Structure formats: C-alpha cells, structure tokens
Amino acid sequence: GKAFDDGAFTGIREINLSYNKETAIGDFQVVYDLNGSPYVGQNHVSFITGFTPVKISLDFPSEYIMEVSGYTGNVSGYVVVRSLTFKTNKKTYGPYGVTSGTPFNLPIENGLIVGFKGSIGYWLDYFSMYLSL
Amino acid sequence: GKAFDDGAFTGIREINLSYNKETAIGDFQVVYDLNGSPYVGQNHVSFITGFTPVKISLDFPSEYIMEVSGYTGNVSGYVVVRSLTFKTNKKTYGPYGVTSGTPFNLPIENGLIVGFKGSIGYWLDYFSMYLSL
Amino acid sequence: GKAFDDGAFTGIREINLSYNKETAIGDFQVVYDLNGSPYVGQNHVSFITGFTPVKISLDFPSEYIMEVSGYTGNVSGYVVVRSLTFKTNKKTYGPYGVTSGTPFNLPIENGLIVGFKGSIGYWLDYFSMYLSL
C-alpha cells in the first residue's frame, strides 16, 4: 500500500474513516489540533471504493482517546486492519469494520495520542501512533 | 503589550525580526517546521514603526539553534528585550539591537527549541521558549 | 492482588519472572539501569508458590526491548496475565507461561520501556509500562 505519516500535533479533534463490513478499514483522515486551532490532515484513501464512511467528532479538549483497539486479519491474502474501536473518557466509538482475526488494544494510562502513520492499499495495511504527554 | 503564544512545532526554519539600534527588539515572526513542511507563524508586530528588519534563514534540518542570548533593560521606563543573538551549529546570527543592560543566555546541550511565546508592545516585553527532544 | 509501581528509570538490564505452564505468570522483578548503574527493583512475589523461574539478561545498552506480547485469560475465575514474550533487537525471550486466552502486543517504533507497574495476587493480575525517549 501507500505509506503515510501525518506526524505529531497537539491533540485530536476529529477522525474520519471508512469501512466495509465484509472486508476491512479503508480510508483514514484526521483533523488534529495544532496549538488551539484545527489542522486538517491529508485524506489517506483506499485504492478502491465501496466503503461506508463515519465521522467521529470529539469534544476537544475535554474529550480524548483513552484506548484504541481492533482486529488484524487476512483479506484476499493480505494482512490488514479489519476493525477499529476508539474509547474516549466519554463514549466508545465503534467497532467499525469486521471484528474477526487477531485482536490488539492500546490502553493509555498517562499521555495522549497526537498523531498517526501507516499504510493503505485496498485496505489499511498497518498503523502506528505518536504518543506524548 | 499584546501577548502571543505560537505553541510547539517540529522545528524552526526561519526567524524574521526587527530591531532599532537605539531602543530594542520590535517585530517577531517565525516560520516553523510542521512535520516536514513549512508553517508560517503569525507576525507579532510592534505598536510602532521605525525598526530595521532582518531575516534569519536556517539550513533546516541540518542547522539548528544551540544557544539564544541577549540583553534586557529599561527603555522609556519599560523593561524590554533590547537585543537577541542566535547561535546555531553553523553560524552566529546577531547581535541584533542594543547590547546594553542585563545579559541572559540559554545554551542547549540536548534538545531543540520548538516554539516561542511572549509579549510585544512598543518593544518585545518578554519571551519564553518551548523545548523538546 | 497487591499493587506495585516501580516507577521510571533510564533503561532495563534484566528481568526475573516466574511462570507455571498450567496457570499463569507469578513473580516479577526487574533490574533497571539508573544513569549508568544497575538498580535492583523490588521483587514482586505471588501469594503462592510452585512457579518456574527464568532470568532474562539483556546486553545493555546495545540490546533493548522492541516488543512485549502475551495473553490474558481466566484462571480460577480471575482474569490474569497468562504468558509474556519479550522481543529485543537481538533475540526473542519466551513465550513464558500459557499461550491461551486473549492476545495483546505492544510493538515500539520509537522510544523505550523504562518502568513497570501492576498487581500480583496468586498471579500477575495486570501490568502497565512506562515509555520514554
């Protein structure tokens, strides 16, 4: 897939992603906070279409992600991220996608997610997160 | 003066400031690096005019500030920053302004300056720096 | 169980833990690096016995943990950490314990594990990790 790296910011305001309940996660885009102002990150799109979009608007700065979880598995011979769930101090968003395969979860006790990087081909191949105090 | 706070970024690419050899530092503006791309910070201007501008273009990312020094003193009854000097791993820029008053200097052994905040009225009243690894 | 919190240090030199191939992880103790010198952390012991010990000596500072993985599951009605695996830039230590239940894994792209906290009763109830640059 095509690798992307948004880098690190001051916080997260909104997440826009798409999924297909039969395959995996597709598009991924984040609106970050940059020192008090919104900063629209680049839209990282799948090479294909047919995904269902969803918008996750956080009540920044009072609301923030405390845990990210999901599943990774094989789709058409490729290991990809099949589902994602975002748990904040207020609500739980998701799961989005297919909850099948190998689970993973990153609970944060102290700190914040301030950026994302990864790769998307037909689906989200992999992703990593920037953490800061 | 009017307080300003640019916040924190990924690095520094260019600094644009103005000074008057009879008084102190006036305008202050920084072009930061934001995850590999230039980010033009807001221009923080003096309430008055008559300053001499100067542009400090750094060879980012190979060149970075290793020490900031200057002088603070009274001008028309106000304590302000009268001069600034920026020393990088390649050159020394300045001193700009009047080298009279009380000196100060911040040498950095490990880390980087990634942001500025302060206040400007007729002159630069005070300033602080964001540091990060 | 009895909660423990070693806090944060400069790095990790050695890990001493015990496990039972029929149940879960028991004792946990770490020898940290504290500014160039070894610092022996407190031994956090299970309320019971019958565990098999193992010593993981790292070639500090050239060798460091890049990924921690394991399994959590029910044992006698309690959710505990049943197995742990430590992957460094040189070898893979483990898995130690029972590889049954729900998997989890924390790969580190940039940064270091510099401390542990958690709780141990009959078995390791849960644990968290301190991360730093």
Binding site: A8, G70, T72, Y78, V79, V80, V81, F104, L106, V114, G115, K117, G118, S119, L124, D125, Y126, F127, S128, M129, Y130, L131, S132 | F9, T10, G11, I12, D33, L58, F60, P61, S62, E63, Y64, L112, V114, S132, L133 | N105, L106, P107, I108, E109, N110, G111, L131, S132, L133
Partner: peptide, 15 residues
C-alpha cells in the same frame, strides 16, 4: 538533527 522526536508505538497489522 533539528527535527523533534516523539514516542511511537506500533505498527499493528501487516509487517
């Protein structure tokens, strides 16, 4: 270098 660093955890998914 003159570029700020941050802790990064991952990746999860394909290796």
């Amino acid at each position: 270098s003159g570029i700020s660093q941050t802790v990064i955890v991952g990746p999860w998914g394909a290796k």
